Amino acid sequence: ECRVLSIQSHVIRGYVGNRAATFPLQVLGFEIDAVNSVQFSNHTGYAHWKGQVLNSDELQELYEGLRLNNMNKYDYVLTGYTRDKSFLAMVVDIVQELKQQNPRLVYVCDPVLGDKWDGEGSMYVPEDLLPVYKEKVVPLADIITPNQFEAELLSGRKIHSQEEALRVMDMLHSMGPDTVVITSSDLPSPQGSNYLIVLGSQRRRNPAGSVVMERIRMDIRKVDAVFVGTGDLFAAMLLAWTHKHPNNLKVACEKTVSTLHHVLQRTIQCAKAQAGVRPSPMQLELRMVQSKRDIEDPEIVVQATVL
Amino acid sequence: ECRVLSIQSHVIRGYVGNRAATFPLQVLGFEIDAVNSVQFSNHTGYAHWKGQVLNSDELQELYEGLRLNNMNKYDYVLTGYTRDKSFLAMVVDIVQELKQQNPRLVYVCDPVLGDKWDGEGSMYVPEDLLPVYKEKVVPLADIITPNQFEAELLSGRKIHSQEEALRVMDMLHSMGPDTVVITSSDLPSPQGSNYLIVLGSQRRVVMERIRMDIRKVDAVFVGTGDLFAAMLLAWTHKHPNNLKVACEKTVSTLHHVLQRTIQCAKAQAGEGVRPSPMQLELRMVQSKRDIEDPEIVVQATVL
Ligand SMILES: Cn1c(=O)c2[nH]cnc2n(C)c1=O
Ligand SMILES: Cn1c(=O)c2[nH]cnc2n(C)c1=O
Ligand code: NA
Ligand code: NA
């Protein structure tokens, strides 16, 4: 089996965090264990929400149970939105130990920090997490999925073009991860302003022992709606597809993105049908269960360009 | 869509409570929402375990979030192992309101209280819960899945035979639930000493009673009851007026999961060697196909 330790948020209603990542990965045959970092009624995008949060001591306690039972052996660790520094610090110590047990362990990290909605975006998490991500998390990460804003904060350099983005990706590689994917863009696109850019870069040592790097690009059609959990789903699927195609970033990224496409298209349709009228957050909840078939064998609806 | 609110335990490693009921129900297309009554590193059958418990106040606030957003509309509610009196009490108040919100809501309840090994009965929860189950839970439930021991405790009458079991089930029906299934019993089967009898009764007035003779296994699995209730919910949903088929698919599904689980357990633990709780964890993920369309391997007989 292939074991994944996913430490993310949980909601009763809806799909974000572990709710967005668990079903798909289970459907794909992964033994995914879910540590819920928070338990809320629904995501914070709704008008109302209530719930509890897990603290760093409780996380450590849970890991103790696993350790005591000699069940602290994983192939992958997967994290995303993290709200607290001591929690993030604990996540770091846990990954560090799991990597000692298994040096081949792959840590997939979605470095959630914030986004843009003008020019100079804003953060979604305490600023004191940035230094921890820079000095502790990223260095341990093997695969990261920052958006442009996050790539800039992590690298400490702004991005105004594709070449600058690639330079940032090289900087991020030097910080630690062999696979870097700047998930969202807003860089010029030959197809217009209705498209966003996805850039991916993967460094690996081939059979002959040569260290090479593969770079790809995708121009994805934007959507006129605010979805939640897509980044969590993107990271989970990237994990799954790079696992299946370890030396082919292109195919891995094309399947990840296509899976997202099918889920979002189905979600958009159902959302509209449930009215007209801008759908509510509830109606825009990802149609995960209904996308089982697309998750298993996604029809490739987009092709990446080689860089 | 068919929404299900499942209030059960959560474990990081393994499959029990919500871990045993969610994946299968999702695979089957249900929009199941999971309220984790606890979050443990693994079930209590291991040498060690750590975790936290959700208290009744936390359950209420989580529900408040749903209510405030008008997301308190469910087609089903699913509960199982509960340990606190106050938590269970909070659970009935919620089902109470959810039923007020949706009169057609079906409440599937697995009355976890205890079980009888050799002959004597052992309790799994504080006895201060029995009164709550009898007086408030069961009366609210529409489908219950007690083993023989639990049925005896709920009805207050002992069972020594099949017809006494059916009379107890008639008693449980009068208490409220239209569907009653005795998932496990000490009753004898002509199939041999290695089989146990399962009895089901559904009211809809017409009554449908069925019987299944199931093979036993010299191994202790955790989460099977949780999975049984989830699947019974799923299949009774697909076949609402046919307890016979709903139970054959439910039991057939468990068979495939346990069969696969036992084989992998022995493969990991050499022949002759008794598998550990870790090796005995249900092989849920690998049973996706069996959950979607279970090959029928057991026939129920209409009584
Ligand atoms: C996007 N998103 C959310 O909106 C959210 N809300 C609560 N947890 C959450 N998590 C983990 C998340 O990733
Ligand atoms: C059988 N069983 C257990 O033994 C257990 N232990 C902790 N949660 C548990 N749940 C939800 C359960 O169903
Ligand atoms: Na992101
Ligand atoms: Na039981």
Author numbering:
A (entry chain B): 4 to 279, 282 to 312
B (entry chain A): 4 to 207, 214 to 312
What does the article say, verbatim?
PL kinase is one of the key enzymes involved in PLP metabolism. In the presence of MgATP, this enzyme catalyzes the phosphorylation of the three inactive primary forms of vitamin B6, i.e. pyridoxine (PN), pyridoxamine (PM), and pyridoxal (PL) to their 5′-phosphorylated forms, PNP, PMP and PLP, respectively. PL kinase is a homodimer with each active site exclusively formed by a single monomer. The ATP binds in a shallow cavity at the active site, while the vitamin B6 substrate binds in a solvent-inaccessible deeper cavity opposite but facing the γ-phosphate of the ATP.
Theophylline is bound at the PL binding site in both subunits, with an occupancy of 60%. Occupying the same position as the theophylline is a 2-methyl-2,4-pentanediol (MPD) molecule at 40% occupancy. Possible contacts between the active site residues and theophylline involve a hydrogen-bond interaction between the hydroxyl group of Ser12 and the N9 of the theophylline imidazole nitrogen, which is also present between Ser12 and the pyridine nitrogen atom of PM in the sheep PL kinase structure. In the theophylline complex, the C6 oxygen of the piperazine ring and the N7 of the imidazole ring are adjacent to Thr47, but any possible hydrogen-bond interactions are considerably lengthened beyond 3.6 Å. In the sheep structure, Asp235 makes a strong hydrogen-bond interaction with the C5′-OH group of PM. This interaction is conserved with the C2 oxygen of theophylline. In addition the C2 oxygen atom is involved in water-mediated interactions with the side-chains of Asp235, Gln11 or main-chain nitrogen of Tyr84. Both PM and theophylline make hydrophobic interactions with the protein residues Val231, Val19, Tyr84 and Phe43. A bound Na+ in the hPL kinase-theophylline structure is located at the ATP binding site, and is coordinated by five well-defined water molecules. The intricate water-mediated interaction between the Na+ and the protein is believed to stabilize the active site conformation. Detailed kinetic studies with ginkgotoxin, theophylline, lamotrigine and enprofylline showed the compounds to inhibit hPL kinase with a Ki of 3, 50, 56 and 228 µM, repectively.
